[PDB]
Scaffold this active site. Sequence first.
Site, PDB file in Angstrom:
ATOM      1  N   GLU A 104     -58.015 -33.844 -60.981  1.00  0.00           N
ATOM      2  CA  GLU A 104     -57.071 -34.372 -60.014  1.00  0.00           C
ATOM      3  C   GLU A 104     -57.786 -34.676 -58.700  1.00  0.00           C
ATOM      4  O   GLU A 104     -57.605 -35.738 -58.101  1.00  0.00           O
ATOM      5  CB  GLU A 104     -55.939 -33.358 -59.814  1.00  0.00           C
ATOM      6  CG  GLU A 104     -54.916 -33.753 -58.769  1.00  0.00           C
ATOM      7  CD  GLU A 104     -53.493 -33.405 -59.184  1.00  0.00           C
ATOM      8  OE1 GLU A 104     -53.310 -32.467 -59.997  1.00  0.00           O
ATOM      9  OE2 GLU A 104     -52.559 -34.075 -58.694  1.00  0.00           O
ATOM     10  N   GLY A 109     -68.178 -54.471 -64.026  1.00  0.00           N
ATOM     11  CA  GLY A 109     -68.430 -53.728 -65.247  1.00  0.00           C
ATOM     12  C   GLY A 109     -69.897 -53.611 -65.622  1.00  0.00           C
ATOM     13  O   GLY A 109     -70.258 -53.742 -66.796  1.00  0.00           O
ATOM     14  N   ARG A 114     -47.950 -44.859 -58.216  1.00  0.00           N
ATOM     15  CA  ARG A 114     -49.053 -44.595 -59.132  1.00  0.00           C
ATOM     16  C   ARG A 114     -48.639 -44.069 -60.502  1.00  0.00           C
ATOM     17  O   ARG A 114     -49.260 -44.400 -61.508  1.00  0.00           O
ATOM     18  CB  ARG A 114     -50.035 -43.628 -58.468  1.00  0.00           C
ATOM     19  CG  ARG A 114     -50.174 -43.863 -56.965  1.00  0.00           C
ATOM     20  CD  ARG A 114     -51.280 -43.019 -56.344  1.00  0.00           C
ATOM     21  NE  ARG A 114     -52.571 -43.587 -56.678  1.00  0.00           N
ATOM     22  CZ  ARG A 114     -53.331 -44.298 -55.850  1.00  0.00           C
ATOM     23  NH1 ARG A 114     -52.958 -44.537 -54.596  1.00  0.00           N
ATOM     24  NH2 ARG A 114     -54.455 -44.812 -56.306  1.00  0.00           N
ATOM     25  N   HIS A 162     -70.246 -41.746 -61.150  1.00  0.00           N
ATOM     26  CA  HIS A 162     -70.182 -41.808 -59.684  1.00  0.00           C
ATOM     27  C   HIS A 162     -71.609 -41.948 -59.162  1.00  0.00           C
ATOM     28  O   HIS A 162     -72.482 -41.137 -59.516  1.00  0.00           O
ATOM     29  CB  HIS A 162     -69.525 -40.530 -59.122  1.00  0.00           C
ATOM     30  CG  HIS A 162     -69.536 -40.463 -57.627  1.00  0.00           C
ATOM     31  ND1 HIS A 162     -68.639 -41.163 -56.842  1.00  0.00           N
ATOM     32  CD2 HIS A 162     -70.396 -39.861 -56.770  1.00  0.00           C
ATOM     33  CE1 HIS A 162     -68.951 -40.998 -55.569  1.00  0.00           C
ATOM     34  NE2 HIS A 162     -70.015 -40.215 -55.498  1.00  0.00           N
ATOM     35  N   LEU A 200     -79.497 -48.354 -62.674  1.00  0.00           N
ATOM     36  CA  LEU A 200     -80.427 -48.166 -63.786  1.00  0.00           C
ATOM     37  C   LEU A 200     -80.302 -46.743 -64.329  1.00  0.00           C
ATOM     38  O   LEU A 200     -80.410 -46.528 -65.533  1.00  0.00           O
ATOM     39  CB  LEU A 200     -81.879 -48.451 -63.348  1.00  0.00           C
ATOM     40  CG  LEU A 200     -82.199 -49.904 -62.945  1.00  0.00           C
ATOM     41  CD1 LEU A 200     -83.703 -50.032 -62.666  1.00  0.00           C
ATOM     42  CD2 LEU A 200     -81.778 -50.892 -64.063  1.00  0.00           C
TER      43      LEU A 200
END
Length: 200
Positions: A141, A11, A64, A108, A171
Amino acid sequence: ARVAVLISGTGSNLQALIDSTREPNSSAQIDIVISNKAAVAGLDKAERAGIPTRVINHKLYKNRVEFDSAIDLVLEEFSIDIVCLAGFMRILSGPFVQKWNGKMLNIHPSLLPSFKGSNAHEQALETGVTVTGCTVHFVAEDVDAGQIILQEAVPVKRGDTVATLSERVKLAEHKIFPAALQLVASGTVQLGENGKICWV
């Protein structure tokens, strides 16, 4: 906006997100941090920040949709408005993603569309780019393919390992992820009806 942050590990993005939601004029607050894995450092960070946590083991579900529904239940329990994926490693099912369309963001570690996938840094190093970066995008999706909100370029230094490149990119993540959350929470940025990002 009431925000939920899903995680699967350390995290590293939580602190920047948490601090941001507590700065003056924030339009968001983090009400729950959910992990699909037990005993990951991200959970402690949440607790120390005074935020409730929940561990929903994805390995305990049939498929899922089942796992996603258990998450959706907690999100409802906390009347969550926006979901942030911060190091969350489970691909979500279509029904869940459609339900949260325009309200779920992901960070990402690459400049999408380059290097989709969880081993973005390894791909960057293998390809030989001198410039990589990070991207905050609405979740669609298709993995790492939703509409782009913000991006920040980060240089790759000769001799970088996955570890050093990763640290430099984190960063940049700490800057754009909180900024993107604020843009969406304030209604400044929205996923338009035509499926395109729109700045109000």
